[PDB]
């Protein structure tokens with residue numbers, strides 16, 4: 026028993042992390058087969074990041090402008106092209122540590138692990154969710170661009186995120202591995218703001234089930250509600266509305282605890298109207314929304 | 328910027344995890360050079376765990392009673408001995424993925440990463456602290472014994488924890504890698520309880536500094552206090568007393584923010600007397616004590 030913010034083991038990804046230098050700008054790249062993927066703003070100087078023309082900036086470079094280091098080994102760039110907001114650097118050597126992988130775009134509310142890296146060197150791993158406003162609440166310093174987010178599906182690494190930038194509110198924005206931004210953001214140092222965030226309701230319910238599984242039951246009650254009555258009050262507190270797909274997704278957790286989904290919604294509805302009043306749930310005094318139903322099952326059943 | 332519960336990258340440890348089977352009991356082992364380390368209760372049947380005599384149980388086994396699997400490969404046990412609460416299985420093959428390592432015993436209040444494993448297979452990584460009562464608030468299911476806790480110091484893995492058992496309160500207990508338990512616990516299925524836990528004060532202060540570094544300043548005030556006045560009120564709320572060593576350890580964070588340690592203690596003293604009143608700090612509505620001063624520096628400066 027117990028419940029922790031748990032990330033995927035990062036070994037398979039650590040072997041793909043490289044350092045990419047172009048000019049006086051160094052950041053991280055992802056080396057899979059004979060391609061290195063990295064954020065395209067590695068080709069910008071400090072002055073270019075204000076209003077860059079990446080097509081111009083790229084035509085003025087040659088393969089030898091790109092320094093790629095995999096630990097102690099230098100990799101020879103033999104070709105380069107731009108795909109949306111990423112750079113694809115073709116290199117002479119295929120990465121022998123290339124895992125089975127795919128590129129997936131995730132949806133708001135889903136979670137993934139982040140391997141934070143500096144100078145091509147893995148520094149830490151943590152778990153986060155893609156917010157409904159397409160930002161992530163990450164932990165990133167200067168030099169972290171090119172760090173990647175991933176899930177592991179059996180023996181297959183699903184890459185879903187490459188880090189690019191921090192917004193003025195201190196939250197983080199990036200792309201999928203095809204270079205398409207999550208959210209309405211661009212890779213230039215302009216003033217862009219995220220839209221308003223909402224709480225991921227299906228994830229809160231999943232976490233309440235994790236609490237029951239671990240012996241926290243004080244918030245339960247005998248009432249029930251309907252999808253429409255719940256959604257009416259959820260709107261008022263900035264909670265995502267709940268659908269029948271969500272209810273179905275919570276099925277396994279309903280079965281294991283014998284508490285129906287709409288039963289648990291009545292508890293949630295009560296917690297929203299009255300608060301926790303100095304009580305905690307799984308060691309927290311706020312409602313946690315960064316665990317999916319699948320995360321809970323994975324941790325509370327295996 | 329940002330602040331997350333961040334674990335060390337686990338790749339170097341994933342390569343040392345093996346499956347150890349003896350009888351109908353399977354758990355995890357740690358394979359370094361030509362020794363596999365695992366909890367000694369792998370030699371117990373379901374009936375033996377109530378009052379085991381491990382010296383008797385061990386003399387009745389031979390090397391071939393021990394099935395050791397490193398993925399698909401079987402390892403031949405060529406010798407076995409018991410060191411306190413661990414088993415040392417000598418095998419014919421040295422682990423080629425053996426990192427630079429050492430065995431260290433940590434102190435209450437210090438943090439480490441845990442690689443949770445099942446059947447020799449790494450399942451997840453998370454960060455925790457050794458509590459003042461020598462338990463950890465982990466997340467572990469049946470089959471997790473032999474999972475290890477570690478820190479990474481440059482290129483060197485410091486192993487500090489091997490998991491053995493869950494106590495009735497749902498918290499976890501284990502040994503260092505020499506087989507000596509943390510806390511007054513024994514590896515038999517008796518009724519043992521942890522002593523009362525306290526809050527790790529130096530860690531709370533470190534986290535308040537992380538909050539200031541990230542722009543949360545609402546709890547600051549102009550007062551100051553002395554070590555003795557602070558410690559007087561801290562005792563009443565079950566907080567560890569604060570020493571001059573702690574003050575010195577918080578120096579780098581005091582320097583970076585321009586707020587003296589005893590200045591921040593007055594803020595803490597205020598938060599203990601009055602609470603947060605619906606405000607949060609770094610996304611939490613409780614005071615967090617599982618980040619050391621070193622964790623904060625590592626994440627907020629690099």
Ligand SMILES: CC(C)C[C@H](NC(=O)OCc1ccccc1)C(=O)N[C@H](C=O)C[C@@H]1CCNC1=O
Nearest residue numbers: 074165166167168169170189190191212213214
């Ligand atoms: C998209 C390009 C214009 C470059 C990008 N811009 C950007 O974040 O500007 C706003 C900003 C700048 C500096 C500090 C705090 C906020 C940029 O600096 N990326 C960094 C590259 O490693 C990563 C950033 C650095 C802080 N944490 C991160 O995640």
Ligand SMILES: CC(C)C[C@H](NC(=O)OCc1ccccc1)C(=O)N[C@H](C=O)C[C@@H]1CCNC1=O
Nearest residue numbers: 376467468469470471472491492493514515516
């Ligand atoms: C020290 C020996 C007697 C064996 C040990 N005893 C023990 O925890 O009994 C109390 C108990 C038992 C079952 C379930 C919940 C609580 C034991 O079962 N270890 C398990 C070996 O993988 C790991 C445990 C299992 C739950 N989570 C863990 O961390």
